[PDB]
Amino acid sequence: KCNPLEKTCPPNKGLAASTYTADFTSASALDQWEVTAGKVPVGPQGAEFTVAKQGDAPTIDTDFYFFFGKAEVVMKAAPGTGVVSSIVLESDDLDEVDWEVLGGDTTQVQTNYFGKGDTTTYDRGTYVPVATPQETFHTYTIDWTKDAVTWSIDGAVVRTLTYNDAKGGTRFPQTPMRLRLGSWAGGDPSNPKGTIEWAGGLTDYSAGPYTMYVKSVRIENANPAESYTYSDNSGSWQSIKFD
Ligand SMILES: CC(=O)N[C@@H]1[C@@H](O)[C@H](O[C@@H]2O[C@H](CO)[C@@H](O[C@@H]3O[C@H](CO)[C@@H](O[C@@H]4O[C@H](CO)[C@@H](O)[C@H](O)[C@H]4NC(C)=O)[C@H](O)[C@H]3NC(C)=O)[C@H](O)[C@H]2NC(C)=O)[C@@H](CO)O[C@H]1O
Ligand SMILES: CC(=O)N[C@@H]1[C@@H](O)[C@H](O[C@@H]2O[C@H](CO)[C@@H](O)[C@H](O)[C@H]2NC(C)=O)[C@@H](CO)O[C@H]1O
């Protein structure tokens, strides 16, 4: 994880196709993914992100990066107090767009972003109404262009971030991003008071295994390439070299 605003890092492996599809009911679905933590079994309901015990943070990263386009995930959130179901887009410069569902909040899901790992205040967050995310599969779409990031649920736009809303684009996500899917306990007793408070309370690991399900992943690469290179330390999209 070398940050190109701080130094010169090697190229990011890119998705050299205009679309990527993963149906997680097949075994060879994690061929272009890495299991970064825990075990992630593949079931009849798709890939399973289970918080069974303390420290369980099962995550999968794509091997590839994409430079603008679409990320669509069909997910059922994990239940349980303090359990976080996360759909994360992140670049090496720490540009990020994400979706977070909390097990005890049955009426909403959170949308969030940051530019260049800048979490000056936690004012980049938005709660949007969703019907029983822990009991119903929903399609979480992020549309990503130079002009705006759009968050949609089951084909309905629920949030738009334009380039200038991100401090005139100084904090807009515009660098090659990999998709991470995972569940973790934000209510882990060992987290800061503020994280446990945010996650909607403490996690009772005894009270069940809590499973997050991802049936499918759809990625559209607006700029298909074998690799992406950060030319400068500007962290801007104009500084991304590829062919
Ligand atoms: C700035 C910001 O707000 N960023 C958010 C992201 O943090 C967040 O992604 C999730 O973040 C959590 C908390 O950091 C993370 O959970 C942690 O995962 C790591 C690795 O799996 C664990 O660290 C390891 O712990 C083991 C113990 O089993 C050690 O042996 C090992 O040495 C540790 N390794 C390292 C490198 O530290 C933590 O234990 C674990 N914490 C908990 C409480 O479970 C999630 O995995 C992140 N999830 C995803 C999908 O990225 C993101 C999503 O909510 O949102 C951003 O806003
Ligand atoms: C110690 C600390 O930073 N505590 C609180 C924050 O954790 C919390 O922000 C939330 O952090 C999570 C990652 O650990 C994110 O997944 C989550 O999206 C993020 N929430 C927001 C709104 O960005 C905030 C929440 O208000 O409170 C801090 O005090």
Ligand 1 centroid – CA 78 distance (Å): 16
161 three-state secondary structure: strand
Q: Which atom of ligand 1 is nearest to the CA of 188?
A: 43
At 67, list the tokens: 């430079």
Number of H helices, E strands in the chain: 1, 18
Q: Which of 205, 211, 220, 218 is nearest to 47 (CA)?
A: 211
Task: Give the C-alpha distances (Å, rounded to integers) separating 75 from 36, 106, 160, 195, 217.
Answer: 19, 14, 21, 23, 9
Q: Which of 62, 73, 59 is nearest to 16 (CA)?
A: 62
Ligand 1 centroid – CA 2 distance (Å): 17
Report the C-alpha gap between 102 and 62 in whole angstroms.
23
Report the C-alpha gap between 150 and 161 in whole angstroms.
6
Domain count, the chain: 1
CB 48 within 8 A of CB 25: no
Phi, psi (degrees; rounded to nearest 5) at 57: -140, 60
How far is the first Cα of the chain from the last one, in angstroms, to the nearest whole number? 23
Q: Residue 9's domain spans which residues? A: 1-243
Report the C-alpha gap between 138 and 45 in whole angstroms.
13
**Resolution of the structure in the document, Å:** 2.8
By the 10 Å C-beta count (0-12 exposed, 13-18 middle, 19+ buried), 224 is classed as middle
Ligand 1 centroid – CA 38 distance (Å): 12
CA 79 to centroid of chain Cα atoms: 18
Report the C-alpha gap between 208 and 14 in whole angstroms.
39
Report the C-alpha gap between 161 and 141 in whole angstroms.
14
Has 6 been labeled as part of a binding site? no
At 94, list the tokens: 């720490």
At 199, list the tokens: 């996650």
- Provide residues with CB under 6 Å of ligand 1: 37, 55, 57, 59, 84, 86, 88, 98, 100, 112, 119, 180, 182, 184-185, 188, 191
At 241, list the tokens: 């070299």
Report the C-alpha gap between 13 and 61 in whole angstroms.
13
| Residue 100 among the catalytic residues | yes
Strand (E) positions, the chain?
12-13, 19-23, 33-37, 42-43, 46-51, 59-62, 69-76, 83-91, 96-102, 108-114, 125-129, 138-144, 148-153, 156-162, 177-185, 210-221, 227-230, 240-241
| Tokens 């800061």 found at | 192
